[PDB]
Amino acid sequence: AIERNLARMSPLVSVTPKKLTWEDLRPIGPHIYNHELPEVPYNAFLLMSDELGLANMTEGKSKKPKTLAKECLEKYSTLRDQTDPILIMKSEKANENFLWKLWRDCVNTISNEEMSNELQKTNYAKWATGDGLTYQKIMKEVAIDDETMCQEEPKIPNKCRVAAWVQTEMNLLSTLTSKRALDLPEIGPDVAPVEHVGSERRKYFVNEINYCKASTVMMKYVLFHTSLLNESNASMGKYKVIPITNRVVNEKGESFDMLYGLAVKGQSHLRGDTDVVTVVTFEFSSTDPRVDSGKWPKYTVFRIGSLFVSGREKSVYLYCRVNGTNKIQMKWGMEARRCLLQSMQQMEAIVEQESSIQGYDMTKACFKGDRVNSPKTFSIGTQEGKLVKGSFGKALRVIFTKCLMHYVFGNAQLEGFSAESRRLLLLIQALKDRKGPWVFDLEGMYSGIEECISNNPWVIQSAYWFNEWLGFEKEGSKVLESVDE
Amino acid sequence: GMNINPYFLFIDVPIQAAISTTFPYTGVPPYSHGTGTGYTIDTVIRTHEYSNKGKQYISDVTGCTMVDPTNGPLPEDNEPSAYAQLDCVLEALDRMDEEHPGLFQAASQNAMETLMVTTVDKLTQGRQTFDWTVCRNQPAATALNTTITSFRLNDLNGADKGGLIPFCQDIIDSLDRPEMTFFSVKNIKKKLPAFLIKRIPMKVKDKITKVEYIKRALSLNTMTKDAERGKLKRRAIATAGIQIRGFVLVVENLAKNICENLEQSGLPVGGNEKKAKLSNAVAKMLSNCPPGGISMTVTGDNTKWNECLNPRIFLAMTERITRDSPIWFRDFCSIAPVLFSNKIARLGKGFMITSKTKRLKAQIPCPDLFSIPLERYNEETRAKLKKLKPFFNEEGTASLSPGMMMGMFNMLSTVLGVAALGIKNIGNKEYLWDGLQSSDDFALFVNAKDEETCMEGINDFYRTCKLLGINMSKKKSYCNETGMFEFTSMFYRDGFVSNFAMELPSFGVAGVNESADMAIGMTIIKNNMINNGMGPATAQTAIQLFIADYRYTYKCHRGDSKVEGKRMKIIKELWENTKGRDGLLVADGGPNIYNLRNLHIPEIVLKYNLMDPEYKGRLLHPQNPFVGHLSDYDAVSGTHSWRTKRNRSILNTDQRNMILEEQCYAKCCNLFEACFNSASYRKPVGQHSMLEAMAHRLRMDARLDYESGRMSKDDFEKAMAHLGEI
Amino acid sequence: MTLAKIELLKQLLRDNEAKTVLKQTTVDQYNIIRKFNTSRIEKNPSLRMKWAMCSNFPLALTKGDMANRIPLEYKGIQLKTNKGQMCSIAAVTWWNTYGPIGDTEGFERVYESFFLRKMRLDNATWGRITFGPVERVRKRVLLNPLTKEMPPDEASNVIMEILFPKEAGIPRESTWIHRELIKEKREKLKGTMITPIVLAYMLERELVARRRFLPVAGATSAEFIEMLHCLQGENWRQIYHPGGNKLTESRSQSMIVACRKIIRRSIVASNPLELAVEIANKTVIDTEPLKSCLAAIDGGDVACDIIRAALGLKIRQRQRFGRLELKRISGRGFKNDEEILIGNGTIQKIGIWDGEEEFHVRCGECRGILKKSKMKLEKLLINSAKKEDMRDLIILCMVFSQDTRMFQGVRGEINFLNRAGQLLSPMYQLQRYFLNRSNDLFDQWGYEESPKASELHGINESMNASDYTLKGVVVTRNVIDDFSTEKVSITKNLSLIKRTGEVIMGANDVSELESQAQLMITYDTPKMWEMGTTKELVQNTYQWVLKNLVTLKAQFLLGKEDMFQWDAFEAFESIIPQKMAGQYSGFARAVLKQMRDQEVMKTDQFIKLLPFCFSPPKLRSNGEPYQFLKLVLKGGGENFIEVRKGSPLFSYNPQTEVLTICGRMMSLKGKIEDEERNRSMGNAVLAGFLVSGKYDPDLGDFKTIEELEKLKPGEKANILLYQGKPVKVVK
RNA sequence: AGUAGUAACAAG
RNA sequence: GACGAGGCUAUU
RNA sequence: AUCUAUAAUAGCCUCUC
Ligand SMILES: *O[C@H]1[C@@H](O)[C@H](n2cnc3c(N)ncnc32)O[C@@H]1COP(=O)(O)OP(=O)(O)OP(=O)(O)OC[C@H]1O[C@@H](n2c[n+](C)c3c(=O)[nH]c(N)nc32)[C@H](O)[C@@H]1O
Ligand SMILES: [Mg+2]
Ligand SMILES: [Mg+2]
């Protein structure tokens, strides 16, 4: 029966096999290169590379977030007492007067002798938090009778092009700093030799990750989300000022409490997991928003003062933004430390491979080299169209930053892009291994990839990076086409 | 300057070796919002589009519009097709039977034995189940109890016999009753000023007609799925009722028995067992490659797997498999495909229409979708409703004869895929194909003399699958030389590589309680070390991160820390009062002493010798009030085995009557357990009433106490009087 | 409290809803109404817990005096609600700080298994940690040790007997073996106040086994599975010595595995006896020398006896077939693979033992002498013992004999593969199948007149002596005192010969089945890796070649044949099947010689082929080497080396100059000449063949190995090196 | 507004 | 408002 | 030689555009 049915089945019913070549792999998402679209704006819940933390020496006594914020503001009294705003940039639909009033109310509430962080429900606070904005629910009969009630046209995420600030953020977040933010608790003493090996390797890995800017940003996110969830549960019907705080340790062992800004939590009656609580964030920064204005459509920036870091003083701006979050996002922010694991497990695996090839632990050799082996190096990036190499620790920091960005910019667009581009990556690997891959509908796969590149900054930058790496891989393969031929 | 490109890692590491970095599972999983009606209507429309060239008629039992693509015209293009040919399916099944003698007979006999020794309580083992009495979703046990009670109202007492077979006979008979009486839920609305509307549910008798009951029995309740990774767009899932679930079990058991003995099936094996089987199969295919030839592996997914598979083909499959079985079992196995061929899809909550200027919103339910002009719907919804109209039922449902929206035939769908894999050749051509199947995912190994012959074999396999109603996705499938492939998200590159990312979400605090969560976290770390290639340094870091997450979740920071909190004050007081502080649990502010070598030891046991006697006695108090007690029996678990009172207090709903029935059941069950201490450990058996069993047990206990001196004359007389009065 | 229960039932029966629920709900339907719940269970408990811990009173208190002991407030912290009383986590902390002190007898008893686990960890020694390839196999293994193990149904029946004897139901005969145990347990729990269900799961924890599929490498005993996460990864091994005591069966199995590995390594060496002795003297089974373990245990296999003879010990010719011990008396058997048709109709591949053999058979108490022949059970002389033990011994002897009647007596379902497709020993499966269904075996075997001799009488299928008895079995009154010896001298080739010179055992009788030892085996020698699996050996050999690449290449260019002799290559030779070792050696030597002499040298191919040049060459009758497309190695279908293309064990990327060996990447940068990228691979794939030019269409399709082998010298041929790259070669 | 994204929340 | 199947885990 | 045998609840992972 199968033979008879296949005999009469049309030839048009075909899998249409096509041998894959490097020339068939085109760049993914060409629209990210056309300047008609606006460059993708900054939409992360908090500033990451533009963050500025007011530092106050502590005595290892985590008194209270309110007391910490008050003492930090007391140290920087000029910023605390700045009352007259000089507007620098304004969000399209924001009321800069209301935002400045809310900021001043936050500062006054933090600085008052009272022990509470509650804010009154004033006109500007109500506007900022979005009070009374939910639609009234009416009966089905009246709505059906009412001809003006129509189904809303869904809002689609818009299309954006590559923005250089994502590359800048990647470059800056993966660099080493002088501050440690990780607060890893102790474990039991090592007894088995495998435990001692693990501790010796953790030394290098943590020392590499703990000092990078991405670790400090991740800790800020984790602590803020923890505080926000606690406040949302504890204070459902109150406006609360939640300081954005961190604790860092210098290379000399001295600790600092860092205040990056203040947040205002709106009413939190989150019955559902996707229910939204509005958070109004006021974050200190030194970046002038006008240098690349396309990055800050969502921010209302005032200039509030200046600070001294060296012989040249640096301006201090206040980035003010209305934002929102839900319980799922708060829960997943409290557990962002897992980024570490995903970066560590990968890199450790590589080290283990080398160990199996050498017959001894290769952590020190991989990180810094030894008598018999030169330090292991990875292609890390580009500089003026030429491939640049970096150390093992740099690659570890890059992978950690990538995982942190997966958390920060993660949504359905990133998920779909990751899956489809993973299929494409497997095809490229097949090409590199000289496995002679074949395809059936390559344009369909490319369309599946490109359906997910709309406005996620990480997805757009990932498409750009994928195209760059694919070009480099084509250049490399050009030499593999003339072996025994 | 120098710009970081993370993809450059792949220049040094092969994609498979660094595959974990392509899974962004530290980010928030996508969640669905609002109604799933749009997705359900899209599913209905697409299911009917893939079968529109089939036989369209009207059901004489329900009056629904029915589409039958089976034995329909062969496809003329590469679009998804549901026009499976019965002859080709039977030929594939006969080839499978020839290659595995006695497999169908053994599987059918084992399934029949299991069914004969299966009780009605097997149906309580499900999650949210569609309840026809309330036309809602209720826990599987609740829906089963409601169905049993309603059947009792309609002279249907098969469930008393205890077996699944008499209850399924009762379901079949219920389908024939001219009318149905049952208990349903009715809400009373009260006006509580704030004004708000307060809902008070209660049970009330109700009656429906034969056709309405049949449509409810065949109905599927549709909802939206959340927390799904790797998908840009959301989808709708479906759940069936008790009538369907009764019969799905036997078909699933039969298909599982068949699949377990197929070397080409990836089900029901999973985890390390699946890895071992797959590795063995790949090695076998590698060694079986003809010399001097080419072996090529196709990583493939099937597109529209559930949409295009037809329950009629499944009925044919079941009839073929149970060829040598008694007639009763063949009918029993045929029931489920029949019910699925006549299934009806409930379309969900509906849609929402709003006035932006007036700031108003309203929910139009499914029965009233066409009550408003289609111009008041948005573009996509209007088009979908226009396409849905022919299959729409006036009560708010849709006829869904084609397709497999439920997705309850994973094993049988795998059997069909393996039957496709078992052809291995068309027309004596110079190629041979084999492979592995897991539902819609497959890996196809084709051995031939050159690449072109392998491509011809792949095309032949594609067309053969088309003949069986299976559509290989040309967009998400690819092929290469054997040695590297992907199957069910497992990546083989000269062996299966570890994928650590998929395990990341499990490294958090479980959310049972402090002690259980500590145990779960340590066990997760240990098993990830064993299975997912997690090195010792990463394992220790995972211990540290879990400890940090645990301390912040349970507000049990180190007793020598300066963190603030209601619990932390007492934690610091305990830290001051304690001498052997190394024996304190982490939940009590104690230090963490876990390392790699002791991940498998519970925390209390690990610190047992270090505890101070007073702290140990307080912690392990037999009568601590934080753990439930049986009623006063002693509880050996500590004070950290507490339970959270999960009160699902839906806002503005006052369950003054549902809670009453729940409490009545609880009191009866508690008394029964007090009479029968083994009931919790072993399921009690018996077709007699609980009252009679309890009465006889108490009579025996009283008499034996009297004879043993445990009870005196007066108490014995009282007990006998009460028993006789009862 | 019977009267209290009766009064409670009477009070409950007043409620009409409760009365109707009790009257209409069957005992079976209780299991339904126990799970009745009007509300769905909340999902995502992690988020629910993170949210609830921020609440004020998320914990439920059990009403009673102990809940009342908790103060309403403590230093400005409200611990309990002032319906269902709720408390804060601070209430739990307060109880742990100032609560009443209780007796901890219950916890110590309920979790005794975990305390044994902790003690096993504490009384353990840790060895060194080694870095290197570790090939792991996924096997179904036991997770936790159990003193007594039974299947879940038996354990459940025993637990019901111990804890709920009244409502236990039918006294299943399967519980008989455990009756004594039950009494013992009822002794310990007579006056315990612990809730019975907790005790039941304690007993399950003590009795019911948990078996899971896990990746293991050389240590499958539960004591080692407990520490598996620390034992090894994919690239490192951690020596571990668990505390407690280990069974004799585990020691015997581990020593059998060790001896088989030693023989397999030694046979390919020059003077195998000396190497075998050297390795054996340094072999430790967990924490005891191999020689001592061989001296103590009374058992083993051919390899164990050979190692005993090599060490100067006395050979014990004992064999184990599950339930019975068989001591050789006379005769030598040979195992051959053959497809046997089972009674069910399915042909199964089984190892059949030929020849005539005599065995002292012991099972429980029953003893006997078994005379077996190829595929036939000649005779079995038995002594009177327990009828049950007598019939188990008889059926065990019949199945052990591989008789045709036994195979044809199968009527039902027999699984020779587990759900993962792994091969289960056919003979043990047959033994298990026929143990519980001996009726069909006896019916198929046949019967004949019982012997009428003075001391000989038959036995029937009715487990009693009678005038009818099954063929072959004969009872005797000649009491035998079991087994309580021979003297042999081990020769150079590990063959055991008597004083007469006849060979009684040899290295060719050792089973080739690779198995996972139950106890960790260590070799206290720097060349321990030579006793590893095929993949580990391949990776280590190629790593050694890479480490000495420069000196090896220099010796090759200057020297001619001394480079082919190395101990690393000797270890590599042990994983090559001996049939092809000489042919592979000839092929590889010819290829390397042609690469050198013709000056077209390719480093990747040289490295790939060098290990295969160790065995003495074995050319064809016409004086030319055999030609190969791939060199197959022991174990698995993925263990082979492709001459032309890459292989799962060996692949080379010329673009990046990266060698992938068993999944590990190494760099040839520096140890390579870039000009080798322009060099043609067609000169290093066939012995005696050199690339003559471009692929000529005139010659036709690409020739095969046998077609190449028959070509005359100076003749061209089209060759496909690999996909998309043809070439033509000449001899 | 904002969150967000094919449909919701922005309290009931 | 959150289904089916497979594997693994914890608990009674 | 683990093939057998295996109560219930819950969690995590895998498996339409
Ligand atoms: O688990 C494996 C092995 O380690 C274990 N085993 C074998 N011998 C022992 C002893 N003596 N103590 C503890 N454990 C032991 O059983 C498995 C054996 O696997 P394998 O080596 O592959 O088995 P083998 O190849 O030897 O043949 P097999 O039929 O499985 O029998 C193994 C065992 O039985 C002996 N045997 C059976 N028969 C019918 C034999 C025969 O006819 N002639 C001879 N000479 N021996 C026979 C085998 O020789 C072994 O003793
Ligand atoms: Mg697939
Ligand atoms: Mg799929």
Side-chain angles (χ1 to χ4, degrees), chain C residues 252 256 260 300 319-320 328 335 353 357 372 400 511 513:
Chain C
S252 181
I256 288 164
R260 287 182 181 179
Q319 279 165 21
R320 183 74 63 73
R328 158 73 56 53
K335 191 180 176 183
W353 291 84
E357 320 193 49
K372 165 189 177 303
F400 169 88
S511 178
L513 171 60

mmCIF file of all heavy atoms in Angstrom, chain C residues 252 256 260 300 319-320 328 335 353 357 372 400 511 513, chain F residues 1, ligand 1:
data_model
loop_
_atom_site.group_PDB
_atom_site.id
_atom_site.type_symbol
_atom_site.label_atom_id
_atom_site.label_comp_id
_atom_site.label_asym_id
_atom_site.label_seq_id
_atom_site.Cartn_x
_atom_site.Cartn_y
_atom_site.Cartn_z
ATOM 1 N N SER C 252 34.392 -10.939 46.208
ATOM 2 C CA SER C 252 34.648 -11.955 45.191
ATOM 3 C C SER C 252 34.432 -11.393 43.791
ATOM 4 O O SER C 252 35.242 -11.620 42.885
ATOM 5 C CB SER C 252 33.751 -13.168 45.433
ATOM 6 O OG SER C 252 33.989 -14.180 44.471
ATOM 7 N N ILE C 256 37.284 -10.897 40.916
ATOM 8 C CA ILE C 256 37.126 -11.485 39.588
ATOM 9 C C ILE C 256 37.362 -10.430 38.515
ATOM 10 O O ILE C 256 38.071 -10.665 37.528
ATOM 11 C CB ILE C 256 35.735 -12.130 39.448
ATOM 12 C CG1 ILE C 256 35.654 -13.407 40.287
ATOM 13 C CG2 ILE C 256 35.434 -12.434 37.987
ATOM 14 C CD1 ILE C 256 34.243 -13.902 40.513
ATOM 15 N N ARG C 260 40.449 -10.492 35.798
ATOM 16 C CA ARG C 260 40.191 -10.465 34.362
ATOM 17 C C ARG C 260 40.922 -9.306 33.697
ATOM 18 O O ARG C 260 41.528 -9.473 32.631
ATOM 19 C CB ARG C 260 38.690 -10.371 34.100
ATOM 20 C CG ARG C 260 37.941 -11.654 34.384
ATOM 21 C CD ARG C 260 36.470 -11.516 34.062
ATOM 22 N NE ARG C 260 35.732 -12.739 34.346
ATOM 23 C CZ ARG C 260 34.427 -12.886 34.168
ATOM 24 N NH1 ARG C 260 33.679 -11.901 33.699
ATOM 25 N NH2 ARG C 260 33.858 -14.049 34.470
ATOM 26 N N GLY C 300 35.858 -17.908 42.766
ATOM 27 C CA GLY C 300 36.416 -17.118 41.687
ATOM 28 C C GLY C 300 36.070 -17.669 40.320
ATOM 29 O O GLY C 300 35.043 -18.334 40.154
ATOM 30 N N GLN C 319 32.833 -22.549 40.998
ATOM 31 C CA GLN C 319 32.038 -21.722 40.110
ATOM 32 C C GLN C 319 30.700 -21.440 40.775
ATOM 33 O O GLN C 319 30.185 -22.261 41.538
ATOM 34 C CB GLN C 319 31.814 -22.407 38.758
ATOM 35 C CG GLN C 319 32.980 -22.275 37.799
ATOM 36 C CD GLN C 319 32.893 -23.247 36.642
ATOM 37 O OE1 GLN C 319 31.819 -23.756 36.323
ATOM 38 N NE2 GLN C 319 34.027 -23.509 36.002
ATOM 39 N N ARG C 320 30.147 -20.270 40.481
ATOM 40 C CA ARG C 320 28.883 -19.827 41.051
ATOM 41 C C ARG C 320 27.886 -19.601 39.926
ATOM 42 O O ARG C 320 28.207 -18.949 38.927
ATOM 43 C CB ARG C 320 29.073 -18.545 41.864
ATOM 44 C CG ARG C 320 27.819 -18.050 42.556
ATOM 45 C CD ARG C 320 27.467 -18.903 43.761
ATOM 46 N NE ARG C 320 28.495 -18.844 44.792
ATOM 47 C CZ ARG C 320 28.706 -17.799 45.582
ATOM 48 N NH1 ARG C 320 27.989 -16.692 45.470
ATOM 49 N NH2 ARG C 320 29.661 -17.866 46.504
ATOM 50 N N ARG C 328 34.700 -28.137 39.900
ATOM 51 C CA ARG C 328 35.134 -29.001 38.811
ATOM 52 C C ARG C 328 35.746 -30.279 39.370
ATOM 53 O O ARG C 328 36.516 -30.249 40.333
ATOM 54 C CB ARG C 328 36.143 -28.253 37.933
ATOM 55 C CG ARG C 328 37.074 -29.120 37.082
ATOM 56 C CD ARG C 328 36.342 -29.749 35.898
ATOM 57 N NE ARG C 328 35.666 -28.785 35.035
ATOM 58 C CZ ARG C 328 36.226 -27.718 34.479
ATOM 59 N NH1 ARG C 328 37.526 -27.488 34.561
ATOM 60 N NH2 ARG C 328 35.463 -26.868 33.796
ATOM 61 N N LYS C 335 33.229 -22.297 25.508
ATOM 62 C CA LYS C 335 32.032 -21.493 25.301
ATOM 63 C C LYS C 335 31.990 -21.004 23.859
ATOM 64 O O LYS C 335 32.996 -20.512 23.336
ATOM 65 C CB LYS C 335 32.012 -20.308 26.267
ATOM 66 C CG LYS C 335 30.696 -19.553 26.318
ATOM 67 C CD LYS C 335 30.780 -18.393 27.297
ATOM 68 C CE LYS C 335 29.508 -17.569 27.304
ATOM 69 N NZ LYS C 335 29.618 -16.395 28.212
ATOM 70 N N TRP C 353 28.203 -24.206 26.280
ATOM 71 C CA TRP C 353 29.436 -24.843 26.720
ATOM 72 C C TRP C 353 29.470 -26.277 26.206
ATOM 73 O O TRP C 353 28.576 -27.073 26.510
ATOM 74 C CB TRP C 353 29.550 -24.810 28.243
ATOM 75 C CG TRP C 353 29.762 -23.433 28.788
ATOM 76 C CD1 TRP C 353 28.804 -22.502 29.061
ATOM 77 C CD2 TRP C 353 31.015 -22.830 29.131
ATOM 78 N NE1 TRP C 353 29.382 -21.357 29.550
ATOM 79 C CE2 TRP C 353 30.739 -21.534 29.603
ATOM 80 C CE3 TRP C 353 32.344 -23.262 29.083
ATOM 81 C CZ2 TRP C 353 31.742 -20.665 30.024
ATOM 82 C CZ3 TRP C 353 33.337 -22.398 29.501
ATOM 83 C CH2 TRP C 353 33.031 -21.115 29.965
ATOM 84 N N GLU C 357 31.757 -32.603 31.188
ATOM 85 C CA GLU C 357 32.281 -32.047 32.427
ATOM 86 C C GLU C 357 31.583 -32.679 33.623
ATOM 87 O O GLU C 357 30.423 -33.094 33.553
ATOM 88 C CB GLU C 357 32.124 -30.520 32.458
ATOM 89 C CG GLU C 357 32.423 -29.848 31.125
ATOM 90 C CD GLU C 357 32.576 -28.346 31.243
ATOM 91 O OE1 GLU C 357 33.325 -27.891 32.132
ATOM 92 O OE2 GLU C 357 31.947 -27.621 30.444
ATOM 93 N N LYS C 372 27.630 -33.510 32.821
ATOM 94 C CA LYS C 372 27.049 -32.693 31.769
ATOM 95 C C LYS C 372 27.809 -32.916 30.470
ATOM 96 O O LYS C 372 29.003 -33.224 30.475
ATOM 97 C CB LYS C 372 27.088 -31.203 32.157
ATOM 98 C CG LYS C 372 26.840 -30.223 31.018
ATOM 99 C CD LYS C 372 27.115 -28.798 31.457
ATOM 100 C CE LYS C 372 26.936 -27.819 30.309
ATOM 101 N NZ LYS C 372 27.808 -28.145 29.146
ATOM 102 N N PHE C 400 21.635 -25.115 34.312
ATOM 103 C CA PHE C 400 23.076 -24.949 34.167
ATOM 104 C C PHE C 400 23.627 -25.816 33.045
ATOM 105 O O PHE C 400 24.642 -25.466 32.431
ATOM 106 C CB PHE C 400 23.766 -25.283 35.491
ATOM 107 C CG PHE C 400 25.261 -25.406 35.388
ATOM 108 C CD1 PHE C 400 26.072 -24.296 35.542
ATOM 109 C CD2 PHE C 400 25.855 -26.632 35.149
ATOM 110 C CE1 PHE C 400 27.444 -24.404 35.454
ATOM 111 C CE2 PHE C 400 27.228 -26.746 35.055
ATOM 112 C CZ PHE C 400 28.023 -25.631 35.208
ATOM 113 N N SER C 511 36.744 -15.039 30.382
ATOM 114 C CA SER C 511 35.635 -14.334 29.760
ATOM 115 C C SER C 511 36.062 -12.933 29.343
ATOM 116 O O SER C 511 36.784 -12.244 30.067
ATOM 117 C CB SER C 511 34.449 -14.256 30.722
ATOM 118 O OG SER C 511 33.379 -13.529 30.147
ATOM 119 N N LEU C 513 33.906 -10.503 28.873
ATOM 120 C CA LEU C 513 32.899 -9.543 29.300
ATOM 121 C C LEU C 513 33.513 -8.495 30.220
ATOM 122 O O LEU C 513 34.069 -8.825 31.272
ATOM 123 C CB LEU C 513 31.756 -10.269 30.007
ATOM 124 C CG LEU C 513 30.722 -9.385 30.708
ATOM 125 C CD1 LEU C 513 30.043 -8.439 29.725
ATOM 126 C CD2 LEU C 513 29.696 -10.248 31.413
ATOM 127 P P A F 1 28.616 -9.588 37.281
ATOM 128 O OP1 A F 1 29.814 -9.158 36.517
ATOM 129 O OP2 A F 1 28.409 -9.088 38.661
ATOM 130 O "O5'" A F 1 27.326 -9.227 36.418
ATOM 131 C "C5'" A F 1 26.084 -8.938 37.042
ATOM 132 C "C4'" A F 1 24.930 -9.585 36.318
ATOM 133 O "O4'" A F 1 24.955 -11.020 36.546
ATOM 134 C "C3'" A F 1 23.542 -9.158 36.774
ATOM 135 O "O3'" A F 1 23.114 -7.947 36.178
ATOM 136 C "C2'" A F 1 22.682 -10.354 36.392
ATOM 137 O "O2'" A F 1 22.368 -10.337 35.007
ATOM 138 C "C1'" A F 1 23.636 -11.512 36.668
ATOM 139 N N9 A F 1 23.466 -12.059 38.028
ATOM 140 C C8 A F 1 24.411 -12.146 39.017
ATOM 141 N N7 A F 1 23.969 -12.686 40.125
ATOM 142 C C5 A F 1 22.642 -12.976 39.846
ATOM 143 C C6 A F 1 21.620 -13.562 40.614
ATOM 144 N N6 A F 1 21.786 -13.977 41.871
ATOM 145 N N1 A F 1 20.408 -13.712 40.037
ATOM 146 C C2 A F 1 20.240 -13.297 38.776
ATOM 147 N N3 A F 1 21.122 -12.731 37.957
ATOM 148 C C4 A F 1 22.318 -12.595 38.558
HETATM 149 O O1 LIG G 1 28.597 -11.188 37.322
HETATM 150 C C1 LIG G 1 29.355 -11.923 36.349
HETATM 151 C C2 LIG G 1 30.464 -12.668 37.015
HETATM 152 O O2 LIG G 1 31.347 -11.801 37.742
HETATM 153 C C3 LIG G 1 29.634 -13.493 37.964
HETATM 154 N N1 LIG G 1 30.421 -14.627 38.503
HETATM 155 C C4 LIG G 1 30.946 -15.592 37.757
HETATM 156 N N2 LIG G 1 31.579 -16.434 38.564
HETATM 157 C C5 LIG G 1 31.450 -15.988 39.808
HETATM 158 C C6 LIG G 1 31.899 -16.473 40.961
HETATM 159 N N3 LIG G 1 32.606 -17.596 40.885
HETATM 160 N N4 LIG G 1 31.654 -15.864 42.127
HETATM 161 C C7 LIG G 1 30.906 -14.686 42.127
HETATM 162 N N5 LIG G 1 30.445 -14.200 40.901
HETATM 163 C C8 LIG G 1 30.732 -14.866 39.772
HETATM 164 O O3 LIG G 1 28.497 -13.914 37.149
HETATM 165 C C9 LIG G 1 28.599 -13.155 35.919
HETATM 166 C C10 LIG G 1 29.480 -13.970 34.971
HETATM 167 O O4 LIG G 1 29.644 -13.284 33.729
HETATM 168 P P1 LIG G 1 30.519 -13.963 32.563
HETATM 169 O O5 LIG G 1 31.911 -14.066 33.043
HETATM 170 O O6 LIG G 1 30.234 -13.259 31.298
HETATM 171 O O7 LIG G 1 29.887 -15.435 32.490
HETATM 172 P P2 LIG G 1 30.661 -16.597 31.687
HETATM 173 O O8 LIG G 1 31.158 -16.005 30.428
HETATM 174 O O9 LIG G 1 31.611 -17.235 32.621
HETATM 175 O O10 LIG G 1 29.487 -17.645 31.321
HETATM 176 P P3 LIG G 1 28.055 -17.671 32.075
HETATM 177 O O11 LIG G 1 27.191 -18.632 31.359
HETATM 178 O O12 LIG G 1 27.580 -16.285 32.266
HETATM 179 O O13 LIG G 1 28.433 -18.314 33.494
HETATM 180 C C11 LIG G 1 29.250 -17.597 34.419
HETATM 181 C C12 LIG G 1 29.716 -18.550 35.515
HETATM 182 O O14 LIG G 1 29.026 -19.814 35.294
HETATM 183 C C13 LIG G 1 30.052 -20.714 34.794
HETATM 184 N N6 LIG G 1 29.527 -21.768 33.895
HETATM 185 C C14 LIG G 1 28.256 -21.936 33.547
HETATM 186 N N7 LIG G 1 28.194 -22.988 32.737
HETATM 187 C C15 LIG G 1 26.956 -23.519 32.121
HETATM 188 C C16 LIG G 1 29.427 -23.468 32.579
HETATM 189 C C17 LIG G 1 29.889 -24.499 31.874
HETATM 190 O O15 LIG G 1 29.131 -25.200 31.207
HETATM 191 N N8 LIG G 1 31.253 -24.786 31.885
HETATM 192 C C18 LIG G 1 32.094 -23.977 32.645
HETATM 193 N N9 LIG G 1 33.400 -24.217 32.684
HETATM 194 N N10 LIG G 1 31.573 -22.956 33.334
HETATM 195 C C19 LIG G 1 30.254 -22.709 33.300
HETATM 196 C C20 LIG G 1 30.994 -19.770 34.100
HETATM 197 O O16 LIG G 1 32.213 -20.441 33.751
HETATM 198 C C21 LIG G 1 31.177 -18.886 35.290
HETATM 199 O O17 LIG G 1 31.654 -19.677 36.381
#
